[PDB]
Design a binder for this molecule. Structure first.
Ligand code: NA
Length: 130
């Protein structure tokens, strides 16, 4: 499933993402937009280190979920990476909440730094009723 902008915004709000660990909803929308284009089944293989990025927030298999093929990896979210590819994004959200609970916060994703940090991210939630 590929979410539409406002549908995703309302879904994230219902899942308790607005202001989670100081991160506004528009920042989460900006992250999702650049990481996957709001595509819940998106996957990206990183040939360089043999890890794979999964789902709407493109969560990496080295530290967050288990896919069995990533060398010396851990499973901090205690989830199969398969769980991060469902149309129902509850598990991906729970795992993203775990990711930001680390020191770096939202900065854990390089794409956030490149295209969201210090920018006007209001456009991502404008008119969605959130
Ligand atoms: Na892992």
């Amino acid at each position: 499933k590929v979410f539409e902008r406002c549908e995703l915004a309302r879904t994230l709000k219902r899942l308790g993402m607005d202001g989670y660990r100081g991160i506004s909803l528009a920042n989460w929308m900006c992250l999702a937009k650049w990481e996957s284009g709001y595509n819940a089944r998106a996957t990206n293989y990183n040939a360089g280190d043999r890890s794979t990025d999964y789902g709407i927030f493109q969560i990496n298999s080295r530290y967050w979920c288990n896919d069995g093929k990533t060398p010396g990896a851990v499973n901090a979210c205690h989830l199969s990476c398969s769980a991060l590819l469902q149309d129902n994004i509850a598990d991906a959200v729970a795992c993203a909440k775990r990711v930001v609970r680390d020191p770096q916060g939202i900065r854990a994703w390089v794409a956030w730094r490149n295209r969201c940090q210090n920018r006007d991210v209001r456009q991502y939630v404008q008119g969605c009723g959130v």
